[PDB]
Amino acid sequence: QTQQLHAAMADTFLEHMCRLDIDSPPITARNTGIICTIGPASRSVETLKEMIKSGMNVARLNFSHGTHEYHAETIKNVRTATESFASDPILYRPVAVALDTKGPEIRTGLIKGSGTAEVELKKGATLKITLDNAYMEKCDENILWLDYKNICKVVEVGSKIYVDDGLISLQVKQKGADFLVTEVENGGSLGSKKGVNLPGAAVDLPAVSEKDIQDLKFGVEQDVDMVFASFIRKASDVHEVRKVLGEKGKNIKIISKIENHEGVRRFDEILEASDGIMVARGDLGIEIPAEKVFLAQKMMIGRCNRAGKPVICATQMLESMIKKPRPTRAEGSDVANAVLDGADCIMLSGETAKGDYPLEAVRMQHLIAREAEAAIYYLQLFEELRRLAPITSDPTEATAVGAVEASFKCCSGAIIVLTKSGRSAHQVARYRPRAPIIAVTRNPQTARQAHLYRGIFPVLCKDPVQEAWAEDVDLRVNFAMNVGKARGFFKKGDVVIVLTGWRPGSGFTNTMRVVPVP
Amino acid sequence: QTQQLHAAMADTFLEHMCRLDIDSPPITARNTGIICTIGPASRSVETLKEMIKSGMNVARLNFSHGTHEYHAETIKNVRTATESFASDPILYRPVAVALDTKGPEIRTGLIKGSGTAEVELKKGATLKITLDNAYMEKCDENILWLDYKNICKVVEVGSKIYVDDGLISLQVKQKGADFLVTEVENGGSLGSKKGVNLPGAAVDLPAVSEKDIQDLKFGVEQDVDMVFASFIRKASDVHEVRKVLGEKGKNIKIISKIENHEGVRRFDEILEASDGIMVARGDLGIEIPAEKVFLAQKMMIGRCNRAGKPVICATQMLESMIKKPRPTRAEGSDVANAVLDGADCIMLSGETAKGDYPLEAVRMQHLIAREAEAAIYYLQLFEELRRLAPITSDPTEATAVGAVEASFKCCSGAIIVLTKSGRSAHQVARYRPRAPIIAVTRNPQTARQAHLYRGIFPVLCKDPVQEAWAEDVDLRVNFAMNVGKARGFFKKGDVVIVLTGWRPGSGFTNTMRVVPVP
Amino acid sequence: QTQQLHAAMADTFLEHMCRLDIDSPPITARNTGIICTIGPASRSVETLKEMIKSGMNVARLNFSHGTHEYHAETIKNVRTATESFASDPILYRPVAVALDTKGPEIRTGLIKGSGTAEVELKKGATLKITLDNAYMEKCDENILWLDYKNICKVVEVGSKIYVDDGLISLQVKQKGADFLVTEVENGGSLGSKKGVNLPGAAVDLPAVSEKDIQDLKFGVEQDVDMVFASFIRKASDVHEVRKVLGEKGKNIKIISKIENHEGVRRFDEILEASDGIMVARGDLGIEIPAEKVFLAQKMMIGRCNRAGKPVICATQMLESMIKKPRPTRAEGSDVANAVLDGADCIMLSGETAKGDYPLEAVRMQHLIAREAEAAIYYLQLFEELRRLAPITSDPTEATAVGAVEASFKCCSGAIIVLTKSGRSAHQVARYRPRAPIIAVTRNPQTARQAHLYRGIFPVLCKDPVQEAWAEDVDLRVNFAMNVGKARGFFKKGDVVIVLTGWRPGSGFTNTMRVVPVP
Ligand SMILES: O=P(O)(O)OC[C@H]1O[C@](O)(COP(=O)(O)O)[C@@H](O)[C@@H]1O
Ligand SMILES: O=P(O)(O)OC[C@H]1O[C@](O)(COP(=O)(O)O)[C@@H](O)[C@@H]1O
Ligand SMILES: [Mg+2]
Ligand SMILES: [Mg+2]
């Protein structure tokens, strides 16, 4: 048996687990989008091509580092790699570009005569933190400059301060004027320009600084597809990001990175304001106790699934693959369970940005996601997504759930959907069919943005518009058929579901046909 | 808040029951078919016209009584009453004609007119039973004739003989070559030609007698829509009726009447052989202990529902309405519960054949069914019907379950289906939408046979066949749209689901559209 | 709200996830067993006392390395540490000792001279594998010795050979009688005595070698509690381990390590023969594809849960904590998901055997387990465990399921169970209450082995048997009460469930009492 067919049919979740079978191969199609952070290890056109071949759907540019020039040259490379495959439109893969905001980071200064090395702090040793910009590049084991000028208002005597992915912790002992004396609660090698966290501090930095607006305006000029907004704390932060993109940026997706207590606490208003969510587990597990992160992850994934908005699970998914050709058993399990929880995308960071095995990392994500997608208990998931979704009068929403139901009923090879803006296809994605959603569009950005949604295999029609609209609709369906055939999603005799609108509109999807693939 | 909608959203059946509301009005549409037995109280064109106006769908002719000439006239009156409404294609109701077989009945003879009226059978009195035809019409307290010639072979001293809906019982005290001396165990008033039951005696009467053959052939000739075959004990019994119905009877639905121990015991084969089932409770409740009838009733309804085959609940649903303009509380509950169990149609016998309130009984059935249909727990029923149904490759099957799903999602006004044979619509009905299924057909037989399925409101198109097939389709669609508007099923506000096919075949339904009503 | 109680009351698993709350504190009790591998980092009496305080339940001795003398000292220290708390019976924790077998391992030899230390294998380089004992302690980048004398009988040209947690890979270019020539495909640096894997080779080493025989007998004289048997392929393997243990080691629990393809395939036979299972992910994810491991883990946990037999999740759970004081986000997730899957115990290897932060690794496991236990969807799990158990039994199984039900109904502080051999506490565990199960016993081996079962907090009663049974019962019950109170599991006003035999006996635990705590 294939596709965990035996397990799919169990009357209990327990029995479903018992029936999971190592020797049952998955379907060819992989549903979960893969986002990769591009940096010095993956920036070259040639490796970028392999990455796309290995499965990369979205290139993330981390604006916490680098320069406009650097990132512009990265974007150009992504676009050369991507376009190198346009000669064959049946096999061309759209690739989205995402701008990841710096936001309200606190960084440390430079280490003495930098970067001549690093320092060592020791448990019990004491440290003065100064705001005095004299020490800006004079940081050693005795004094450390930070760039957050209001730090003294916000912390108190006993406050913990984490430095560098939270591996070092200090505790404020002597407070003071515009400086802090602390005892190293937890020591280690301290380098230059490291991140600082102040869990439970009322930190007043904005989500959107002047420098964030300049980055965002750059993203609009660079025609990126999406924005990952860092440290969003309330809806009004999301609205600032969107408004500031202006009319030219109107269709860029806003993804809120939830990465602090207030973000989780205000999750619902943030979700309502956003196009989607990223569970930014890195900062999230320093900001709140690490034992609690999986709770926040499952919470957010549930709510985004319940709302039909994309959710990305991020950070350290395969961390050890920075240095090694295989992941840890923890990492393999982490990716799989993110898929099983319901994440639309999984993300790689250091493992593609800077590691020695970017290509192996991407493949691993692809390989795990597709085993995990077969392992999903669709029986319970579909039922629960139905129950929990409201009665509406939008005919697209009605056609979408109807098509997903039909697809389960006939076990079809795909759901094919024509879409101008993405929406019809996103509506189908919401109900989590097992079959891949082939979204045919002419809008290239629609194609790129479709990767945010579980299940949507976007396809960019290049053919000119027919003047008989009915014939144009057909050209597109047949196009989707050739792609599925060429990719192995289905064969000549199989059946598929095709969603179509009644007029050439723009939001009129309302027709579902069950057809054999020619 | 209308149609038990608060109840419909409950997560448990118990909470659903708690939320049932006496002030929440149902939809206009009524989904359960009403079968009325036609005889002396209901036979004239005038009263037949009121019966249709009242919700009658099927006219049953019971061939345990009358001559062919009598029945020909009844059918002709039904047709006249039905056709009287043809002058307005929108408000016309097809009416089906059903032929109910005598089968292997045992009955007593005629009481001596004197004119005593009825004979008084007294507990402990002796009563001779004879087979001598000279006594056929000379029945009284001392001598009772019976038309089952073998009776003496199949009972023994001490056997029990039941007479008249099982109200009178006799014990065999003495056995003879062509007579029986019995003692009255259960006394009462005995009238003429009463039903006799011998539970657990080994009755050897053929399933299809010469008289039945005659009646079946006349039904073919007369072009009846369906036959209710009495005392079906096994699949081969059904085969005889089908044989005897032959090619000209190709399309007559055979409905097997389950009314003895064997019929229940062999139920699965009879169900696979038949086009439908009738739970024939009158005899059933004499052939098995009466406290067990509800168990038989609910297993047959359950299995027919699981098989997607029409089942009919019959007999004493509103018995007391034979004499009274309003039913007993047990009668109102009985009708409601039959619908609630999933019966496709409910039936009236004496209440329309001979009663003083034929029209009130029909109205009462229409009123209770519509109330009960609003109280069904569809969340659970729809979920269980899906689980239990197999994955097929039949595009029409996929389409049907997709349309029902869409119908719940947008609270649809109706599911409009174009069908020639009826199948496409039968396939929607087996998934039990709440919304009426308006089947548009040009085939008149198909429109009459549709009444056998819960929720199909057949509609007969009379319009000329347009030149262009796509415009002919659209015409049938606009037809159904007008009829639902005319009758208050829905307004320009609403949405309806339209099912359609890709070619003027004859089994190619593969298209569902979700459409705001123009 | 506490304890994710709001999430507990959800109608769907999806809504359950939606309600998972970062600010909802868990209970004090932690149910999942913690197994720690003792090694150079953890072996001192002083470190071991802190491990017990931080949460260690089972000390694991890995007989893949070390001499018997070494292990006997580790064992003696574990007992010195454990017994140093026996002076307060209220706070004493039984600590089990487990022996983890070497089994049919394949290892490389020692590097160097002259090496020095590591040796860099280069992608594309050629490496000769030899079997000549002259090279046993002379390995380098050209020449590698292995201790598997039949390797040559059993790989082929183009077979893959993996070295050191599958991080280095070699392809066989040329075979030969007692050597192999190979090409490095995944390079890296190769240390001494690394594990070798031949996936898809029929490796023919015995289940129980002479060394294993000697190790198991040593296990018997040291009085260990359990044996983790490596590389169990089939039931006769478990039977061989049982024969060595013999009559004298009768009560020692055998936990079969599933770590190769044949073990997964013959899982059901192995589980029937075993006392529990370890999912040994390290070797397993090299033997089968790493993407597949999560599937095997979940199938094994499900089937062990359904059988009521202990299951352990092992290997790389908090790996990065060997060198760092906080785990990665993948690591935190992996631990939570293992507990959410249904695992009875979790395990630490290098992180407590050799790393810089053994105490923090224990604490973290303790913290996550307890967080994950509050997040379980008990409403579904209990329903499923009851449905998959037989409606048969056996008053003892009925009482235990009745106890677990009462325990939810009143948010019991604990279920107190009196047991000689553990069995009755085992029975309660298999139904997965959320409340801790305080198992009171006078048998010290029973108390130590109890840690194999989720939720069983063993408590060793040292008082002599009282003159009246009823006072003997109350003594032990009251002792459970005091331990619960001292540990913060519950207080004076709370209710606990107490399970007991009817007669002074042992098993036949058929009595349940719901009692307030004094
Ligand atoms: O998903 P969206 O943006 O609503 O677009 C769906 C639209 O695409 C179509 O199928 C085709 O329209 P175009 O030919 O204008 O692209 C419409 O019938 C439908 O309204
Ligand atoms: O339910 P049935 O008998 O299969 O008929 C459904 C058929 O009716 C149609 O919708 C219309 O066909 P006609 O124009 O032949 O009536 C077909 O496309 C479809 O196959
Ligand atoms: Mg950033
Ligand atoms: Mg009859």
Ligand SMILES: [Mg+2]
């Ligand atoms: Mg070992």
